[PDB]
């Protein structure tokens, strides 16, 4: 029962400080809560992002600091989504950068 599962990542978000930033979308896109401030870490690429500003979005910020993330790049990973269609809907559209 690892963080490769969206369900497990979502449960790490206990005591999430940001009411305006969606923990569900963060967990859905690879993030788990580190429990240090508002810092989250991606289980697939390892990027850690914190000190979020109200203009920041889950996927764009993730893509901004980690352009080659396997999950965001739509490569094969061991991720287990709660809802596959919802994940496909939120991941960055395909494109060769």
């Amino acid at each position: 029962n690892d963080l490769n599962r969206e369900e497990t990542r979502l449960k790490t978000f206990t005591d999430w400080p940001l009411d305006w930033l969606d923990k569900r979308q963060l967990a859905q896109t690879g993030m788990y809560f580190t429990h240090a401030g508002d810092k989250v870490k991606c289980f697939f690429c390892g990027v850690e992002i914190g000190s979020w500003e109200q203009e920041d979005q889950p996927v764009p910020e993730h893509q901004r600091w980690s352009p080659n993330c396997p999950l965001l790049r739509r490569r094969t990973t061991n991720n287990v989504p709660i809802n596959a269609e919802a994940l496909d809907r939120i991941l960055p559209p395909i494109s060769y950068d």
């Binding site: 690429c45 390892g46 850690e48 992002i49 914190g50 000190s51 600091w65 980690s66 080659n68």
Partner: peptide, 7 residues
């Protein structure tokens, strides 16, 4: 946001 760690 700030990246506390970049791959």
């Amino acid at each position: 946001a700030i990246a506390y760690f970049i791959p």
